[PDB]
Amino acid sequence: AQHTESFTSAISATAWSWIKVLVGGTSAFIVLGLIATAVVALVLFFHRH
C-alpha cells in the first residue's frame, strides 16, 4: 500500500453521526435528572422559610 492506515480512516459520516447521537442522548438524560434533583432541594429549602 502507498498510503497509511489510521484509527479514524474507516469511520463514515453516518457512523460518526450515530455515535454522537448516542453520546449526546445518554448525557442529556443524566443532566435532566441532575437538574430535577437540585430543583426539588430548593423547593424543600423554601417551604421551611
Add this chain to the structure above:
Amino acid sequence: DKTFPIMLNGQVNGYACVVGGRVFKPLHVEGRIDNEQLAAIKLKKASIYDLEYGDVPQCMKSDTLQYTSDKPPGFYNWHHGAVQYENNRFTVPRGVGGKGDSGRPILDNKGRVVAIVLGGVNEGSRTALSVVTWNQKGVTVKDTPEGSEPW
C-alpha cells in the same frame, strides 16, 4: 383521644397517632404496635416529612383532625401541660423531656392536632421541641432547633 404507644420488649419507647385519613409513626424508634389492626398495615418509610400509610378503613378513621390555617401564638394543649408558641415551641419546664415521648401530638383548644414532637430532650432553662407542622399554605415542613437530640 386515641394515640396508641409502641412496644419493644415490654417497655414503652414510642407513640403512634391517628389523624383524619392516615396514621403516623416516628422513625427514631423501633418496635411493634400492640394493636393487631395497626400492625398489619404497610408502614412505608420516608424522609423528614414523615410520610406513612393509613391503610385502615373508614369505620375507625379520623379520631382527630389536623389543624387548619390561621395559627395564632395562643394557647395549645399538651399531654404533660400546655404550650403557647407558633414559630418555635414553648419553653416547657422539666419533667417533660425524658425518653420515649416521641410522637405525642400537640393539640389546640378545639381538640385539633397541630404538631407531632420528635426531639429536643433538654436545652437548659428553656427547652425546645423539634416538631413537624404546616408552614403557611398546608405544606408539611419539619422544624428543628439547634442541638436537638432525638427524643
